[PDB]
Enzyme design. Structure first.
Site, PDB file in Angstrom:
ATOM      1  N   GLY C   8       1.203  -0.967   0.084  1.00 44.08           N
ATOM      2  CA  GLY C   8       0.158   0.079  -0.039  1.00 44.08           C
ATOM      3  C   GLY C   8       0.430   1.091   0.480  1.00 44.08           C
ATOM      4  O   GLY C   8       0.057   2.001   0.599  1.00 44.08           O
ATOM      5  N   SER C  10       1.635   3.914  -2.796  1.00 41.16           N
ATOM      6  CA  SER C  10       1.366   4.133  -3.669  1.00 41.16           C
ATOM      7  C   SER C  10       0.619   5.750  -3.078  1.00 41.16           C
ATOM      8  O   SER C  10       0.317   6.566  -3.987  1.00 41.16           O
ATOM      9  CB  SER C  10       0.836   3.724  -4.753  1.00 41.16           C
ATOM     10  OG  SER C  10      -1.094   3.953  -4.695  1.00 41.16           O
ATOM     11  N   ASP C  59      -4.217  -7.676  -4.914  1.00 38.48           N
ATOM     12  CA  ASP C  59      -5.025  -7.260  -3.859  1.00 38.48           C
ATOM     13  C   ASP C  59      -4.614  -8.495  -3.236  1.00 38.48           C
ATOM     14  O   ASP C  59      -3.762  -9.292  -3.203  1.00 38.48           O
ATOM     15  CB  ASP C  59      -6.623  -7.954  -4.224  1.00 38.48           C
ATOM     16  CG  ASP C  59      -7.873  -7.732  -3.359  1.00 38.48           C
ATOM     17  OD1 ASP C  59      -7.290  -8.104  -2.349  1.00 38.48           O
ATOM     18  OD2 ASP C  59      -8.612  -6.604  -3.717  1.00 38.48           O
ATOM     19  N   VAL C  60      -4.226  -8.617  -1.932  1.00 37.39           N
ATOM     20  CA  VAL C  60      -3.276  -8.761  -0.448  1.00 37.39           C
ATOM     21  C   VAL C  60      -4.584  -9.852  -0.242  1.00 37.39           C
ATOM     22  O   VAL C  60      -3.516 -11.136   0.575  1.00 37.39           O
ATOM     23  CB  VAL C  60      -3.185  -8.372   1.011  1.00 37.39           C
ATOM     24  CG1 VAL C  60      -2.867  -6.927   0.628  1.00 37.39           C
ATOM     25  CG2 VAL C  60      -4.238  -7.076   1.456  1.00 37.39           C
ATOM     26  N   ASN C  86       1.494  -2.104   5.383  1.00 38.52           N
ATOM     27  CA  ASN C  86       0.817  -1.541   5.744  1.00 38.52           C
ATOM     28  C   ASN C  86      -0.906  -1.819   4.697  1.00 38.52           C
ATOM     29  O   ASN C  86      -0.910  -1.983   3.454  1.00 38.52           O
ATOM     30  CB  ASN C  86       1.077  -0.627   5.078  1.00 38.52           C
ATOM     31  CG  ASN C  86       0.223   0.900   4.889  1.00 38.52           C
ATOM     32  OD1 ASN C  86      -0.301   0.479   5.584  1.00 38.52           O
ATOM     33  ND2 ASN C  86       0.496   1.409   3.664  1.00 38.52           N
ATOM     34  N   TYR C 152     -13.100  -3.605  12.342  1.00 40.66           N
ATOM     35  CA  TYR C 152     -11.445  -2.375  12.289  1.00 40.66           C
ATOM     36  C   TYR C 152     -10.699  -3.009  13.610  1.00 40.66           C
ATOM     37  O   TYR C 152      -9.644  -3.526  13.836  1.00 40.66           O
ATOM     38  CB  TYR C 152     -11.773  -1.679  12.211  1.00 40.66           C
ATOM     39  CG  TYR C 152     -10.623  -1.325  11.932  1.00 40.66           C
ATOM     40  CD1 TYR C 152      -9.223  -1.260  10.405  1.00 40.66           C
ATOM     41  CD2 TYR C 152      -9.623   0.297  12.528  1.00 40.66           C
ATOM     42  CE1 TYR C 152      -8.758  -0.904  10.080  1.00 40.66           C
ATOM     43  CE2 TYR C 152      -8.665   0.458  12.236  1.00 40.66           C
ATOM     44  CZ  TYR C 152      -7.858   0.058  11.041  1.00 40.66           C
ATOM     45  OH  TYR C 152      -7.648   0.735  10.617  1.00 40.66           O
ATOM     46  N   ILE C 185      -4.415   9.988  11.973  1.00 45.50           N
ATOM     47  CA  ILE C 185      -3.349  10.553  10.907  1.00 45.50           C
ATOM     48  C   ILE C 185      -3.914  10.952   9.504  1.00 45.50           C
ATOM     49  O   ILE C 185      -4.917  11.117   9.244  1.00 45.50           O
ATOM     50  CB  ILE C 185      -2.171   9.330  10.688  1.00 45.50           C
ATOM     51  CG1 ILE C 185      -2.061   8.777  11.628  1.00 45.50           C
ATOM     52  CG2 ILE C 185      -1.652  10.467   9.246  1.00 45.50           C
ATOM     53  CD1 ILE C 185      -1.354   9.668  12.733  1.00 45.50           C
TER      54      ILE C 185
END
Lengths: 230, 230, 240, 241
Positions: C8, C10, C59-60, C86, C152, C185
């Protein structure tokens, strides 16, 4: 019958602890620094529940006096099976505004109190040859810190470290050593998920559970009773 | 009468929890994956202790089947006041040598089990309008990690995160949500301060305390029952 | 030259990590799920910094694709000395209201991402015979939980447990394995609800910048951090 | 423009390693020791040879009024400290029933009275720099989890964590971060061959840490890059916990 000392048990959380431990079947020795008549009322309540009780008066910071009183009490009544270190003290204020007394009285009451009360009682507990129970009262402030409470956060965090270390030393003798960390108790609300202050019995119930035979595999722990604060 | 579902309660820690909750005065519904006769024996014991009981059979990973069974059970017998999630599988091995099944079944049994069992039961619990109790069973491996258990440590750590988050959502409904993290228990030593494995009732006692009315100010917590391991 | 994979990378935090690691002297391989042109821009920035870079697309969650692409990449370019995981997404909502996909895609992207990406790379890392670095990105929600994020919080807490266990398996290889848990963040896709709730609770009274997270990852990947393993380091402005 | 950091107990060991790393990072570093004056002057000269300004201060951190006077005079002559690293500490190991009054009191006071005695005269001079600040305390794995034979040290080092977290909350609005580094078993701690042998089986890396592996973490937290890290306890322990 197994006997438990509860410090600062003439009122508040300490009184609720003493009464719950008596209801659970322990003999309970009451303690206070100065409010003698208040201590005697708790003694009478415990006797009314069918247990034995009396009170001891001392400042936990008075190392030599505490030693003498506890030595004599153990000689007269036998070793304590349990000790609940409930008494503590705040002196809130921003850190650069804290006075020497604000700092020292807060640090010593918790940490000197731990050493001064437990040092004369470890061997009499071990000599009962039936395990034992030690529970300290810390604070959410000892876990997380709190503004205006650098001294209190340090004192209550130090109590956690002392508790965990002592649990390791006494585990071989089947003495569990644990800490109960209350949040905001009736004796801020919109940071508390349960949206209210805790009641004294909601803290005392956790101490009572830890002192029970059922809690025999729990040691070295800090149990937070804080309505979800952390 | 308040009713509590205990998953995986035909034997072991789950059975000890079921029997302790029955002695405390709850009606207890037993659950097992497949061992029907074992489940019926626990049901008969709860009935001999004076409470109502029946059993439910399902794989906690079978999302739709779980939803159907639990929705039908709530229709017949009312919402559950409590749920004890005792849902776990190990598939130990070094991480690069774990198979896809070793990984997926361990992750899913704990984390899909949490979703599959609790999602159909949250609203029936809220609609009782009397608070509630949810206790999940994690592990010391979920707190600290363990060699050969990257999958199990992940699954049991994930259970802790789900527990804390759900505690925050349900606090306003007076539903406490907590986690019990056993160490090395007899149903699974120089490293354990108490120098012995725990017994199933030493874990069940802590679950029973948390389900009690007395534990009303304890939520969002992970309570370790591990003989001092951490 | 030692090479590090950042998933991740980019945009956002992942891009900040990749650029800081390139500046520290690592070759850095960029990864993205779908935005190939975005990934190629980061590659070009890394090359301009004087390190080798290319990007990988997957795609992970596509386990067999991840394995094939990573094994081919290791055959062509050698094992990775470091991996920064990430990986994750949110699908916020009240727990009774979460859909099957809201739950499953959040759990799998973090936890299957861990397995799918790291399983093909551990032995190639070991075979470098020079230690290694693995850093996972969790979240403050994985430590303490958060309303509307039961999925999450579970995914990011599980990431912590996996990280700690793997640290134990690889410690004798001189591979450290740690987790960085950011608070609120800049550039992170959060609901207005989560953003407001966080800002009132952050002692520094502001969101973190992407480089304030990337700097901690960069430090852990450095040779100086050789005695730090099994840790969760929170970068959250004092939130907890 | 140059920022100055005080490191307590920096004449040797971990504190010395911290001081030298901070000097290499571009801070002026003031050395401190309780009594080993010649040792402290040697570190001062190494910091100077590293390209930064240095001098040393001598005091027992428990001597509250002496500490206040020395630190207030130092700030008047050299300006406020941008950073303070509270590294100096003390052990007096022994089983709890074996501990003397001095064993207990000296260990508790050195860590907790040391925190108050050193930081109280320095917080306002730090704030008045109007450029943020850095405070790092040195705790121990024993302060996190407890250790047999160290009820006193575990208490002292756990209390340091509570003080650190609370102070972080008070100072966050001044852009002063306040953090704690908690070393495991480091090569400077004297242990018998038997104790060392046992400890190495518990540490996943299976070795003691080096002083620079601790100092590197302190140096990172003191850097401008660590501006969003505050209220934290960072363990440097080879995976022990």
């Amino acid at each position: 019958t197994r006997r438990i000392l509860v410090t600062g048990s003439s009122r508040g959380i300490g009184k609720a602890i003493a009464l719950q431990l008596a209801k659970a079947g322990f003999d309970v020795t009451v303690h206070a620094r100065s409010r003698q008549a208040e201590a005697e009322q708790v003694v009478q309540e415990i006797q009314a529940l069918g247990q034995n009780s009396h009170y001891l008066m001392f400042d936990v910071n008075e190392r030599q006096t505490v030693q003498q009183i506890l030595e004599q009490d153990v000689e007269q009544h036998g070793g304590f099976y349990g000790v609940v270190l409930n008494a503590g003290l705040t002196h809130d204020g921003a850190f650069p505004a804290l006075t020497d007394q604000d700092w020292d009285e807060v640090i010593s009451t918790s940490l000197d109190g731990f050493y001064n009360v437990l040092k004369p009682l470890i061997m009499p507990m071990i000599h009962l040859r039936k395990g034992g129970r030690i529970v300290t009262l810390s604070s959410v402030s000892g876990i997380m810190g709190n503004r205006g409470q650098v001294n209190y956060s340090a004192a209550k965090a130090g109590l956690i470290g002392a508790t965990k270390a002592l649990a390791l030393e006494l585990a071989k003798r089947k003495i569990t050593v644990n800490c109960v960390a209350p949040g905001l108790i009736e004796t801020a609300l919109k940071m508390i998920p349960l949206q209210r202050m805790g009641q004294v019995d909601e803290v005392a119930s956790v101490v009572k559970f830890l002192c029970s035979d059922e809690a025999s595999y729990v040691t070295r722990q800090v149990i937070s009773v804080n309505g979800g604060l952390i």
